Amino acid sequence: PQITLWQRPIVTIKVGGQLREALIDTGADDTILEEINLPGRWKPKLIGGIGGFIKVRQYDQIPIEICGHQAIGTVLVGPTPANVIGRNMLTQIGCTLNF
Amino acid sequence: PQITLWQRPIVTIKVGGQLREALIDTGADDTILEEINLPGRWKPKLIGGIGGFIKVRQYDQIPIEICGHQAIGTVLVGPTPANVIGRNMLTQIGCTLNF
Numbered sequence: 001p002q003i004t005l006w007q008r009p010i011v012t013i014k015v016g017g018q019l020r021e022a023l024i025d026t027g028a029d030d031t032i033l034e035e036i037n038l039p040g041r042w043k044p045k046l047i048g049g050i051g052g053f054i055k056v057r058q059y060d061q062i063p064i065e066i067c068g069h070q071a072i073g074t075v076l077v078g079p080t081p082a083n084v085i086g087r088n089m090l091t092q093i094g095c096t097l098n099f
Numbered sequence: 100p101q102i103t104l105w106q107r108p109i110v111t112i113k114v115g116g117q118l119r120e121a122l123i124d125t126g127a128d129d130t131i132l133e134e135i136n137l138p139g140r141w142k143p144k145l146i147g148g149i150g151g152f153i154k155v156r157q158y159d160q161i162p163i164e165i166c167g168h169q170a171i172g173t174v175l176v177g178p179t180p181a182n183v184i185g186r187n188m189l190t191q192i193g194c195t196l197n198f
């Protein structure tokens with residue numbers, strides 16, 4: 001679809017067999033999700049944003065469905081205040097900015 | 100223009116008579132700039148992101164030129180790690196997401 005920005009650009013995702021809402025976030029390089037149970041091995045990572053940093057679990061090669069489009073890539077799980085779909089996944093679904 | 104997301108979506112802005120680069124950030128409700136000298140009255144505000152919060156100065160009705168498009172609105176100034184153009188300004192320049 002086309003999404004205007006009068007409201008937060010929130011879409012439905014499926015990841016790890018679970019349904020969630022997440023923000024289409026062009027200011028995010030990576031995809032970060034609030035605590036969610038994902039299978040398999042992970043690596044601890046510190047990531048920075050406004051306010052400081054958080055510790056996340058990094059999962060690689062995780063399939064995700066983003067508003068009905070299929071992608072696979074790295075998902076970071078940790079105490080983010082919002083689920084954010086970043087550019088690592090947005091590039092796979094052909095998401096662009098236009099003005 | 101159309102902007103793809105293989106790189107950070109950084110554009111040139113003019114604000115307060117000064118030139119800066121800033122991220123087109125659909126995950127930002129507000130526009131937040133690193134320390135920059137803006138004229139006039141401001142109100143202290145605490146804002147939250149990944150990692151916690153920051154104290155910012157809120158300036159209202161600030162004109163900004165964003166990649167050659169004119170907008171006016173609230174700009175928050177504080178210790179953000181990145182200059183971000185949020186939805187309060189993006190809606191004025193007709194910025195949309197497409198996939």
Ligand SMILES: CC(C)CN(C[C@@H](O)[C@H](Cc1cccc(F)c1)NC(=O)O[C@H]1[C@H]2CO[C@H]3OC[C@@H]1[C@H]3C2)S(=O)(=O)c1ccc2nc(NC3CC3)sc2c1
Pocket residue numbers: 025026027028029030031032047048049050080081082084086124125126127128129130131146147148149150181183185
């Ligand atoms: C700040 C930008 C620069 C980065 N962030 C993406 C922004 O869109 C976040 C999303 C957000 C929204 C809501 C609450 C939040 F806690 C966070 N918006 C945001 O903080 O908004 C703030 C601010 C703007 O106005 C209002 O609107 C929401 C809230 C409030 C005040 S990020 O989440 O820190 C992030 C994400 C992925 C990522 N991947 C990385 N990979 C390594 C380097 C390679 S680093 C990295 C850093």
